[PDB]
Amino acid sequence: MNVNEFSNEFDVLYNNIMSNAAPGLNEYEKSVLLTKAQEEIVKNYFEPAGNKYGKGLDDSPKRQIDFSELIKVGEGVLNTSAPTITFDKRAKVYDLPADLFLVINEAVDTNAGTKQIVPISYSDYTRLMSRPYKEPVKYQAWRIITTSINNISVELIVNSNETITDYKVRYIRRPAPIITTNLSSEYGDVTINGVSTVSECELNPIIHSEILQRAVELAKAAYQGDLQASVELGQRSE
């Protein structure tokens, strides 16, 4: 469904049938609520505990097809542009793509073959570095986030006497906002995520109805406006 259909069925589901009908929502408000509902839905469906099914990214066909249009593959750029201080002397710093929402798969291609990057926790890092070896298992590499400015910088730890040729990252692209109409105005240009032009929902049509329902629920919680509704509907932001 295109943006006009988002807005028309938003109006239908919000106030065109309600008995003591409420004021219609302005297009900026509808775009804001739709973008919020989109992000909430993405976060709810990525995490199993966030939805009533207990199903995350790839726990069912529907969850695969939900994020299928939001998956992207890119590469981390070696961060030798400027000097820096790494926590580990034997780690190579890489910069992830700017439009990164969530990392789901990483791999590094070295001279000793491809290796799956395992994101190790800080307590896990301490445990592993208290051991005599201090290097990954055969077909794996280690990873920790380092000092990041304006984009995520990442330290890749591989086994000794190994060089990294490329660093691929299969991630979830940051969703683009849903903007119903050109938000340009003479009184001031308002933006949802830095863009005023019309922006279609760049995800699969399977969850457009879900985004619409969530947006309507958020609109009605805003209309109710007491602390109660804000608190319970803020639980699903996550």
């Binding site: 005599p132 070896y133 201090k134 290097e135 990954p136 298992v137 055969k138 086994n159 000794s160 006497n161």
Partner: protein, 226 residues
């Protein structure tokens, strides 16, 4: 089997990264268990204390084929001068220092007293210290033209007690095997003083038994407190 094949087979036998509960080891851990299994297995095989084989160092063709590649021969003529022995006619010879167990040991004698038998190869007999005093005078088990008594002493030495002058000392022993190192270990780490890759020098027949023993040792190491 090569080092890559030790590692891949070791993972396959441990069911690493399979769906069921399992165990995953680093290449240093794999090397540790492979080398420990190697050394345990060959010591047990030499002494014949392995129940599965139940045979000693060269008691059958199987054990010969297993430990053939550790058998090293040594020859020396230099004698260590200043040392205190249990007889006037005692000479000390250094041991190669990579020796594990001495299996053949013989001594060539150069003396004018044994006329026309000069250069006689003489059997070096390891003698305990109980037996030494009553074996100095023994004409059937003591030192002679055809027999030399060897006693182990400090600093990797062999005290050879002989009636005649000892010229050369020949040995054939079991050597320190090269450790099984699957990866170039980082700085500081090493197995038996070796940091680089080290392949097993034994025959491929026993490599799979070494792999099985290493897997069992790994399961023991991870599951000795649970």
């Amino acid at each position: 089997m090569t080092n890559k094949e030790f590692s891949d087979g070791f993972s396959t036998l441990l069911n690493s990264f399979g769906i069921t509960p399992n165990i995953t080891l680093d290449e240093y851990e794999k090397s540790t268990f492979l080398t420990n299994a190697q050394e345990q297995l060959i010591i047990d095989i030499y002494s014949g204390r392995n129940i599965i084989y139940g045979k000693s160092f060269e008691q059958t063709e199987e054990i010969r084929r297993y430990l053939s590649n550790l058998v090293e021969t040594y020859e020396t003529s230099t004698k260590v001068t200043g040392k205190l022995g249990l007889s006037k006619d005692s000479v000390f010879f250094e041991i190669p220092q990579d020796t594990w167990f001495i299996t053949y040991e013989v001594a060539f004698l150069k003396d004018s007293r044994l006329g026309c038998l000069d250069g006689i190869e003489a059997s070096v007999v390891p003698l305990p210290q109980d037996d030494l005093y009553r074996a100095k005078d023994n004409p059937f088990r003591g030192p002679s033209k055809d027999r030399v008594l060897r006693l182990d002493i400090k600093s990797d030495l062999a005290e050879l007690i002989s009636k005649y002058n000892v010229d050369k000392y020949l040995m054939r022993y079991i050597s320190q095997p090269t450790p099984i190192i699957l990866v170039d270990l980082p700085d500081g780490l090493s197995i038996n003083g070796v940091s680089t890759e080290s392949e097993c020098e034994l025959n491929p027949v026993v490599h799979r038994a070494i792999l099985e023993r290493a897997v069992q040792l790994a399961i023991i190491s991870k599951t000795q407190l649970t």
